[PDB]
Design an enzyme around this catalytic site. Structure first.
Site, PDB file in Angstrom:
ATOM      1  N   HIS A  58      46.900  52.315  12.905  1.00  0.00           N
ATOM      2  CA  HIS A  58      46.072  52.600  11.747  1.00  0.00           C
ATOM      3  C   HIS A  58      45.624  51.330  11.016  1.00  0.00           C
ATOM      4  O   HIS A  58      44.858  51.356  10.049  1.00  0.00           O
ATOM      5  CB  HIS A  58      46.774  53.522  10.773  1.00  0.00           C
ATOM      6  CG  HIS A  58      47.878  52.996   9.920  1.00  0.00           C
ATOM      7  ND1 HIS A  58      49.219  53.151  10.240  1.00  0.00           N
ATOM      8  CD2 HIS A  58      47.893  52.375   8.710  1.00  0.00           C
ATOM      9  CE1 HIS A  58      49.985  52.624   9.286  1.00  0.00           C
ATOM     10  NE2 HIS A  58      49.207  52.133   8.324  1.00  0.00           N
ATOM     11  N   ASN A 118      53.981  32.123   1.116  1.00  0.00           N
ATOM     12  CA  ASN A 118      52.982  32.484   0.109  1.00  0.00           C
ATOM     13  C   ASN A 118      51.626  32.684   0.787  1.00  0.00           C
ATOM     14  O   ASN A 118      51.069  31.712   1.293  1.00  0.00           O
ATOM     15  CB  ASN A 118      52.946  31.374  -0.931  1.00  0.00           C
ATOM     16  CG  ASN A 118      51.999  31.699  -2.056  1.00  0.00           C
ATOM     17  OD1 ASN A 118      50.986  32.361  -1.914  1.00  0.00           O
ATOM     18  ND2 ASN A 118      52.374  31.223  -3.246  1.00  0.00           N
ATOM     19  N   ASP A 162      51.420  55.579  16.708  1.00  0.00           N
ATOM     20  CA  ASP A 162      50.803  54.591  15.809  1.00  0.00           C
ATOM     21  C   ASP A 162      51.259  53.188  16.170  1.00  0.00           C
ATOM     22  O   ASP A 162      52.159  52.629  15.564  1.00  0.00           O
ATOM     23  CB  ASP A 162      51.175  54.913  14.376  1.00  0.00           C
ATOM     24  CG  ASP A 162      50.400  54.133  13.331  1.00  0.00           C
ATOM     25  OD1 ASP A 162      49.408  53.482  13.678  1.00  0.00           O
ATOM     26  OD2 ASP A 162      50.787  54.197  12.145  1.00  0.00           O
ATOM     27  N   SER A 196      52.265  48.192   6.166  1.00  0.00           N
ATOM     28  CA  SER A 196      51.902  48.866   7.391  1.00  0.00           C
ATOM     29  C   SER A 196      51.781  47.886   8.548  1.00  0.00           C
ATOM     30  O   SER A 196      51.170  46.822   8.368  1.00  0.00           O
ATOM     31  CB  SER A 196      50.497  49.475   7.322  1.00  0.00           C
ATOM     32  OG  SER A 196      50.471  50.622   6.505  1.00  0.00           O
ATOM     33  N   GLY A 197      52.298  48.299   9.702  1.00  0.00           N
ATOM     34  CA  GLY A 197      52.225  47.448  10.888  1.00  0.00           C
ATOM     35  C   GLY A 197      53.375  46.477  11.029  1.00  0.00           C
ATOM     36  O   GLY A 197      53.538  45.923  12.130  1.00  0.00           O
TER      37      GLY A 197
HETATM   38  C1  UIB Z   1      46.397  56.182   7.866  1.00  0.00           C
HETATM   39  C2  UIB Z   1      47.775  56.638   7.437  1.00  0.00           C
HETATM   40  C3  UIB Z   1      48.040  56.297   5.955  1.00  0.00           C
HETATM   41  C4  UIB Z   1      48.587  54.854   5.719  1.00  0.00           C
HETATM   42  C5  UIB Z   1      50.128  55.077   5.699  1.00  0.00           C
HETATM   43  C6  UIB Z   1      50.254  56.531   5.186  1.00  0.00           C
HETATM   44  O1  UIB Z   1      51.300  57.069   4.730  1.00  0.00           O
HETATM   45  N1  UIB Z   1      49.037  57.148   5.326  1.00  0.00           N
HETATM   46  C7  UIB Z   1      48.836  58.572   4.873  1.00  0.00           C
HETATM   47  C8  UIB Z   1      49.632  59.581   5.700  1.00  0.00           C
HETATM   48  C9  UIB Z   1      50.695  60.334   5.113  1.00  0.00           C
HETATM   49  C10 UIB Z   1      51.370  61.362   5.801  1.00  0.00           C
HETATM   50  C11 UIB Z   1      50.975  61.611   7.122  1.00  0.00           C
HETATM   51  C12 UIB Z   1      49.934  60.897   7.739  1.00  0.00           C
HETATM   52  C13 UIB Z   1      49.249  59.878   7.055  1.00  0.00           C
HETATM   53  O2  UIB Z   1      49.709  61.335   9.052  1.00  0.00           O
HETATM   54  C14 UIB Z   1      50.695  62.385   9.224  1.00  0.00           C
HETATM   55  O3  UIB Z   1      51.470  62.548   7.997  1.00  0.00           O
HETATM   56  C15 UIB Z   1      50.592  54.045   4.653  1.00  0.00           C
HETATM   57  C16 UIB Z   1      52.008  54.079   4.142  1.00  0.00           C
HETATM   58  C17 UIB Z   1      52.994  53.339   4.835  1.00  0.00           C
HETATM   59  C18 UIB Z   1      54.333  53.403   4.460  1.00  0.00           C
HETATM   60  C19 UIB Z   1      54.718  54.223   3.377  1.00  0.00           C
HETATM   61  C20 UIB Z   1      56.088  54.310   2.974  1.00  0.00           C
HETATM   62  N2  UIB Z   1      57.115  53.655   3.595  1.00  0.00           N
HETATM   63  N3  UIB Z   1      56.437  55.057   1.939  1.00  0.00           N
HETATM   64  C21 UIB Z   1      53.752  54.970   2.695  1.00  0.00           C
HETATM   65  C22 UIB Z   1      52.390  54.900   3.081  1.00  0.00           C
HETATM   66  N4  UIB Z   1      49.592  54.138   3.548  1.00  0.00           N
HETATM   67  C23 UIB Z   1      49.615  52.967   2.662  1.00  0.00           C
HETATM   68  C24 UIB Z   1      48.277  54.271   4.312  1.00  0.00           C
HETATM   69  C25 UIB Z   1      47.799  52.825   4.568  1.00  0.00           C
HETATM   70  C26 UIB Z   1      47.136  55.131   3.730  1.00  0.00           C
HETATM   71 CA    CA Z   2      50.486  30.200   2.980  1.00  0.00          CA
END
Ligand code: UIB
Ligand code: CA
Length: 223
Positions: free
Chosen positions: A40, A54, A84, A177-178
């Site tokens: 993603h 930094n 993913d 993310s990632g």
């Molecule tokens: C593009 C995906 C996005 C991504 C992903 C994230 O959670 N998403 C929504 C999501 C939620 C539930 C789902 C799903 C997608 O697919 C199936 O169930 C991410 C995210 C990553 C980690 C966490 C956390 N550890 N709480 C929190 C947020 N977010 C910051 C986004 C960048 C929007």
């Molecule tokens: Ca730097």
């Protein structure tokens, strides 16, 4: 990272920042020319930034290298976030050193209760937006499958695991993310998704890297 600590410059040498004029995702260096991140996080125009602490100041030890190709898993589903994972090939090989180094892929999956290190430059607040300059770290355990599935019924596939704290307060968040989840010296997860950040009974969800080792190896060897 919510509830974490300052890692210390270059103490997490496999951590990368994916940059398109700004930091938008993390990743992990797995050899001198390949990075693993989340599907993603795909976009065109990625610059990989290695050796960062930094992310807003050039401090030394940085290497900036363009991505030559990004390979999203062919079965990635944007709706469910199943599979993913994405591989990024660097235009040129990184220079490996004590500050820039690769992380090993696992040979077996990790068990519930294993303690892992999660790192990133993501938001540090559960309510509100607060991004750090330097790299933040969090120690978090892998939760059991039963607890994961109770938290997110019907949304957890065999390619996902939960890690974190049910009481809340400590989690990865937007911008992480990632990034890597490293357990006993091995990359076992990728920061994928969750419900908010650091909310009670809603732990983070991570791509289960041990399910993809053969895919990674096959793809790198043919590209
Ligand atoms: C593009 C995906 C996005 C991504 C992903 C994230 O959670 N998403 C929504 C999501 C939620 C539930 C789902 C799903 C997608 O697919 C199936 O169930 C991410 C995210 C990553 C980690 C966490 C956390 N550890 N709480 C929190 C947020 N977010 C910051 C986004 C960048 C929007
Ligand atoms: Ca730097």
């Amino acid at each position: 990272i919510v509830g974490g600590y300052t890692c210390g410059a270059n103490t997490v040498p496999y951590q990368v920042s994916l940059n398109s004029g700004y930091h938008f995702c993390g990743g992990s260096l797995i050899n001198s020319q390949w990075v693993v991140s989340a599907a993603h996080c795909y976009k065109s125009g990625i610059q990989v930034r290695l050796g960062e602490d930094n992310i807003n100041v050039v401090e030394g030890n940085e290497q900036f290298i363009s991505a030559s190709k990004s390979i999203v898993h062919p079965s990635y589903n944007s709706n469910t976030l199943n599979n993913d994972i994405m591989l990024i090939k660097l235009k040129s090989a990184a220079s490996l050193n004590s500050r820039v180094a690769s992380i090993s892929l696992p040979t077996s999956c990790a068990s519930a209760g294993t303690q892992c290190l999660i790192s990133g430059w993501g938001n540090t607040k559960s309510s509100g937006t607060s991004y750090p300059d330097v790299l933040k770290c969090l120690k978090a355990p892998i939760l059991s499958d039963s607890s994961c599935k109770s938290a997110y019924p019907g949304q957890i596939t065999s390619n996902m695991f939960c890690a974190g704290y049910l009481e809340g307060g400590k989690d990865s968040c937007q911008g992480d993310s990632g990034g890597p989840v490293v357990c006993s010296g091995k990359l076992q997860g990728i920061v994928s998704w969750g419900s908010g950040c650091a909310q009670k009974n809603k732990p983070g969800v991570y791509t289960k890297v041990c399910n993809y080792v053969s895919w990674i190896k096959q793809t790198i060897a043919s590209n």
